């Protein structure tokens, strides 16, 4: 053929891939974390937006730390041979490096490690997108006038 | 012939390191609101980083917190794009 360039990811596999949305709204009372009013609006917005991008969306609601880890383990071990990419959206409380299950924290590294180039061969060389709506600390940006 | 195991991840953070992230109980979070609008408007036209750059500007310019508590009133937010991607990403083909 003619000259070719390899500057973009192959996005024309039979499927665009999974879009896992974890929508954590209500937290076990013993944690002392407040309900995240409005996150259902986020969850439905994301579901529709990625539906139209032709992602296979799975909405999960109010998962424990254990359920988040298991879901990530299970999803990583699925057959991604026909999938272009992977998207995981996390909606929860958090702090730097951490997001919360309904019953306690999960290290972000623990979640993303399931998809490492060597631990998830189904996705090696394929874009893995983590979209994280969660606090990263307690600092407030006072902004500056323009 | 090998690639790093950390390659080909992108982390679209709603807020800068160390900071709160703002959520509106009626409208949804500032970040997710803006991300969905920019995806809808530009996913058939722009590369992913350039979409996410529009999300940054939208969150940075169009949103400001309102609170009866002086500590939390009038605050701003910038999201944080973290890319270990090795290629450009277009949602179309």
């Amino acid at each position: 053929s003619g000259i070719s360039l390899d500057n973009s990811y192959k996005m024309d596999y039979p499927e665009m891939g999974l879009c896992i949305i974890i929508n954590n709204k209500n937290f076990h009372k013993s944690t002392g974390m407040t309900s995240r009013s409005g996150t259902d609006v986020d969850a439905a917005n994301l579901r529709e937006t990625f539906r139209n991008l032709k992602y296979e969306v799975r909405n999960k609601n109010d998962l424990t730390r254990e359920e988040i880890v298991e879901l990530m383990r299970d999803v990583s071990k699925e057959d991604h041979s026909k999938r272009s990419s992977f998207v995981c959206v996390l909606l929860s409380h958090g702090e730097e490096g951490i997001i919360f299950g309904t019953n306690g924290p999960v290290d972000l590294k623990k979640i993303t490690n399931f998809f490492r180039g060597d631990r998830c061969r189904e996705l090696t060389g394929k874009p893995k997108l983590f979209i994280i709506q969660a606090c990263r600390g307690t600092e407030l940006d006072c902004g500056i006038e323009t | 012939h090998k690639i790093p195991v950390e390659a080909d991840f992108l982390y679209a953070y709603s807020t800068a390191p160390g900071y709160y992230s703002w959520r509106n109980s009626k409208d949804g979070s500032w970040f997710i609101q803006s991300l969905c609008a920019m995806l809808k408007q530009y996913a058939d036209k722009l590369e992913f980083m350039h979409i996410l750059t529009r999300v940054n500007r939208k969150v940075a310019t169009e949103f400001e917190s309102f609170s009866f508590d002086a500590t939390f009133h009038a605050k701003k937010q910038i999201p944080c794009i973290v890319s270990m991607l090795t290629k450009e990403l277009y949602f179309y083909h």
Binding site: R36, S37, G38, C135 | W22, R23, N24, S25, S67
Partner: peptide, 4 residues
Amino acid sequence: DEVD
């Protein structure tokens, strides 16, 4: 406007 709420924080998380």
